Chain length 208, copies 4
């Protein structure tokens, strides 16, 4: 649990994200909870050119390391960590299916039982606010109070979990749910959903 | 036909499944008929971290090996083996196209002559029941009486065949048929189909 | 221009076809004009297990080499060669977009100027007939009289050209045109097309 | 900044373009501003067979090097360079989503804030003209006056930027925006957009 081991994992997650089809270009940003703040990917630098020393430390006051420029979206990573004390890693990307659902400004309802992985019977869609602002941060903190992932209107996705592996896994699962929703929505509106009682059983089984 | 050779094949099938775009995350489970029960993938463990000793033996009574946790969906693998004595391998996944069709709760009709590979003029869609329950198992056993593959409402796909290679091959073919169906359904409803007499000729030719 | 060099190219084309996303499972078959007949891929054998000695010679009378089983669809390869004397290689597959258009039983109209690569202002769709029959062969020979590629209703695609490289290239281009057509058809019907005068200029430029 | 270093980058961009899913077959062409004209990819030659000595120099008068045949679309590369003095690299391809939007003859509106990367609140669609003509060149020069990328009706995409890395990056981003637009258009028409005031803030933030 040293800085260099955590910085490698961040970089590996960025790579895996691109391999999975979730990250296009310079879109995503990944962070881990560290000491009193977090370690996050830098702004600008292409994923494949990323080295361990590129990773940026931002303390709990929002002061970033000297000589580095953190992701332009670091503020909502810090919002996630303060709103969900159990979150230790945050993955943000502009995955195509999730982003298309966020353009329609729709929550993803319970079309599949794996929706319970984010904590409830839906994936919310937080209202639009300019990237990097305090207004965006507040919408994100409110959307993550009872969910581990949220869409961002006209923007993309944020997923948080107990470690990077799980955070990536959830982000990928939400992109599948988004794709399922858009494919079925093009055929029938509304899309058949599982009832709240059924999601309630699946949530209890997921605890077990 | 030793346990270790069969466990490698299971693992290779999981890998190939992910390579083919049919398996996302920790979704699929694969099994082979063995001795008086089966060998199946474990619950939890990521596909890429899978080693031969991770594969779990479940006897015909449903007792699993000591110290291992079988897939959470082992019960419908056992249902498949008891309902179709000719089945020696079972592939389950949550492939996107198949799962989207299962959300609409539709059978795939004879839109292409390759539908005959699953035994008839359609791919059925068995009704929803919570994962891992006896209720789900009974729907699966009934859907596989005269078909080698079935969709599972709000869930995914099960395909069975005489060996893993063929089971994977069928699962992939059903994902293509699902994609064909959804792409054409978005344009015209209903989708043109081949008549039962024509599927009857194709089935006789497939025996030859 | 020896048999072994031509058999390698067939195998390389099968591999490239799978790499390009045009061939799923055991669906495609590839042939080259040779001596008085052709060399074609065998029936059954997975693409990755294909060796040079697996390639089958079928003479101009339809007699195939001893101990080998040619593709089950060899008859329409022979139909192509007899209908288009300038064709030296034939690529057949069940590519998803082309096959979805063939299910709707539609020709692809001139939605893009690259449609001229197949010889005219459209890609035809020949009527359904059981695979491997003389009836299918006759529809294919008639569709290829003034076109180098045709869809096959409820089935897939055939493309022919002067060598394998060009035949593969055309097959890939027709899969792109099919995808363009289905994506736009889901939005507006009918799809805007280029006029015959414009396709006439593009065809003259393609000669130059 | 020698010719051979610039020719490698062109070739690397062609390869990366194919890897990204933006270039199918022999469709794209890439150029860089050089001396008094440009270096561009040749006509005909497959991307994978491309060597440094294949790259063609075209002076500012349109005279091309002896013994080489420049891309058939070099004229609109020269149009781009003369219309946008700040452009140093041009990427053209027939990416599927962009091309499908160009078939509908629609501009992409501000459905996502990344639309500001091309300079404004939209990606224009320049009217159809035969490839390689002066008429096409004039439409392209007019579309790029206040935008760094444009669709070409019934054809594809052109993107220009300060170097090849950025030009490729923009071309990829526009293909994502096209995909977002088509996916949402199939569900609802018109698609929700961000207001001009909001795009105005995002453009100021992108300067900062
Ligand atoms: Zn973002
Ligand atoms: Zn399952
Ligand atoms: Zn066929
Ligand atoms: Zn072009």
């Amino acid at each position: 649990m040293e800085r260099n081991k955590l910085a490698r994992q961040i970089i590996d997650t960025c790579l895996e994200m691109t391999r999975l089809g979730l990250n296009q270009g310079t879109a995503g940003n990944v962070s881990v909870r560290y000491q009193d703040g977090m370690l996050i990917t830098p702004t600008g630098i292409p994923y494949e050119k990323l080295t361990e020393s590129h990773i940026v430390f931002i303390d709990g006051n929002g002061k970033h390391e000297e000589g580095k420029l953190p992701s332009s979206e670091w503020r909502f990573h810090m919002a996630a960590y303060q709103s969900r004390p159990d979150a230790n890693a945050v993955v943000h990307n502009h995955a195509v299916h999730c982003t298309a659902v966020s353009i329609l400004n729709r929550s993803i309802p319970a079309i599949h039982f794996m929706i319970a992985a984010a904590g409830g019977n839906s994936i919310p869609c937080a209202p639009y606010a300019t990237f990097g602002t305090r207004e965006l941060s507040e919408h994100v903190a409110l959307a993550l109070k009872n969910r581990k992932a949220t869409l961002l209107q006209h923007h993309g996705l944020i997923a948080c979990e107990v470690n990077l592996e799980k955070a990536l896994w959830l982000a990928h699962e939400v992109e599948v749910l988004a794709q399922l929703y858009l494919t079925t929505l093009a055929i029938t509106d509304p899309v058949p959903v599982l009832s709240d009682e059924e999601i309630a059983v699946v949530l209890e089984k997921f605890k077990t």
